[model samples]
Target: MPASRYITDMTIEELSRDWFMLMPKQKVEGPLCIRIDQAIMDKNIMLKANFSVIFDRLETLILLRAFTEEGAIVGEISPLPSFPGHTIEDVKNAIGVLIGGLERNDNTVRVSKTLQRFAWGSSNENGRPPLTLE
Candidate 1:
C-alpha cells in the first residue's frame, strides 16, 4: 500500500499511476486482420496484373474465395488448379500425384486447405514478402 511506512512521501493515486506510467505515448503496434477483405482484393488485383487475366479456370481463385469464405480455414474445390501462363497441365497432371482424384466434379468434390496452398503455390517456405505486380 502507498500508505505504508515505505511510502513515506507517496500517495495512493501516485502508486496506482506509478509516477509517469500513464503519460501518453505513440502506439508501436496495431491489431492484425485490419485488411481482411482488402487483402483479398489486393491479391486478386495482384494476380490479375501478373497473369493478364486469362486463367478463369480461376478454379484456384475459387479456392481462395473458399478459403476466405471458410474464414481462411481449410476448405474445398474441384477439377484442378491450373493457373494460365503457368505450366498448369503439366502441374495438373500431378493432380492425383499430389492430392485429389481423376473423376471429380466442381460441386461435389471438396478438397483441403493445403490443396489451395499447393494450388496457389503459397506457403511459408518462400521469401516472406508480399507479391508484386505490374
Candidate 2:
C-alpha cells in the first residue's frame, strides 16, 4: 500500500510557487506571472464557452465534445480534493480514467500521460499524507 492523501487546492501563487520543484535542475525559460494571470482569468465558463464554440466551428470537430465532457467531469469531481482516501496506485487508476477520457482530444493525446503523472505526483506531494503508521 502506498498511501492515502488529501489534495491541496492551491492558489495560483501557491501552485506557481516552487514550480521547478519537479522540474529538472536546469534553466528552463518560458512565460511567467502573466501566464498565471491568464490561467486564473481564463479558468471559467467564458473560456469554456469560447473554446467550445471555436472548436465546434472548426472543421476538425473531433475533440470538442470529449473536451467538454472532460471539462465537466473535472469541474465536478476534481473538487473532491482527493479520491476518498486512496493510495498512489488508486491515483494511478484515476489518472488512467483521466487519460482515456482526454484521449478524444487529439491535441492532448501526446502529453496527457505526462500531464496526468505530473499532476498526480504534485497532488501527492502537496497533500496530507495517509495514516501509514496508524
Candidate 3:
C-alpha cells in the first residue's frame, strides 16, 4: 500500500517558489489553508515564515505588494510603512526571495531574466504574450 500524504507536509519554502503555477491537491486541514489557497490564486501572498524572522506579517505584506505591483518604484514611495530597526539590506534580502534580485534603477528594480520569462511568456507569432498558468 502507498503511504498517505498530508498538505502539512509541504513546507512554506517549497510552496513560495512553485505554487504560483501549480495548485497542490492535498487538502490542508486548518483555517490558514484557505488563506494560502486564496493567496495562490491571487498571486499576492507571501508566507509569514519568509519574513517573520526579521519583520512582522504586515510589513511582509507591504513589501510583497510593493514588489509585485510597483517593482523598482518601491524605493521612491514616501511615507512607506515603517518596520522598526530593520535596515535597507534587510528588506532587500526579503524581496530577493520573490523576484531573485534587488538591483534598482531610475525606472524599477531589475528582475531576473528567469522571472521575466515566467511572468510574460515567449511572444507568439502575432507578438502577443503567450498565456501560462500565471
Candidate 4:
C-alpha cells in the first residue's frame, strides 16, 4: 500500500511526529502547530479523518478537522501556517506528494490516483523500499 494507506496503521504518536516534521521550520515551532502536536500526543488523535480531504484543505489554509477512531471531531486547526518561502503551486505539489493527486473547483475538492506512482517513487527513496498498492 502507499504510505498514505499506512497512515492509519501508525499510532497517533508516530503520525503526529511525522506530519509535524513535514512542516516548514517556522510552522514546526509555531504555537498552533505545537498545540496541535500536543493534542495528537495527549488525546491520541488517530488517522481517522479522510487524509485526502485534510490535505486538500491545507493547500488553501482552510480549517482542518481531526477525528478520533470512533469518528468524533476532537479538534480543528484553522488558517494553517503560511509558507514563507513557497508559492501556492509549491504547496499544492507538496500536498500532492502526501495524498496523491488533487482537483478543485468552485464547489468541490476531488482527489484521484493520477500521481500515485509518482508519489510512491518519491516516498520510497534512499534505502526505503517502495510500498505496494494492493
Top lDDT prediction, candidate number: 4
Candidate number with greatest TM-score:
2
What are the runs in model 1 whose C-alpha is more than 4 Å off?
1-69, 75-85, 94-134
| Clash list (residue pairs), candidate 4 | 1-132
True-structure lDDT of candidate 4: 0.28
lDDT of 2 by residue, 1-134 (tens): 43323222222332232322111121111110010111111122111100111211211111101122224212111212222332233333333333332332222322233223333344431122222444
What lDDT would each prediction earn against the true structure? 0.23, 0.23, 0.25, 0.28
lDDT of candidate 2 vs native? Answer: 0.23
Model 4: runs farther than 4 Å from truth? 1-34, 37-58, 80-134
Instruction: Kindly report which residue stretches of model 2 are placed more than 4 angstroms away from their true locations once superposed.
Output: 1-84, 109-134
Ranking by lDDT: 4, 3, 2, 1
Tell me the tens digit of each residue's lDDT in model 3 across 66-134: 223411112111113443344433333333332221121111234333222322134211111222365
TM-score of decoy 3? 0.21
Clash counts for all predictions: 0, 0, 2, 1
Which segments of candidate 3 are over 4 A away from where they belong?
A: 1-62, 66-83, 101-134
lDDT for model 3 comes to: 0.25
lDDT of 1 by residue, 68-134 (tens): 2223311112223343233333332233221221111112223333333343343211221233459
Candidate 3 at 67: error in angstroms? 7.0
User: What C-alpha root-mean-square deviation, in Å, does candidate 2 show against the real structure?
Assistant: 19.0
lDDT of 2 at 72: 25
Relative to the true structure, candidate 4 has a C-alpha RMSD (angstroms) of: 14.9
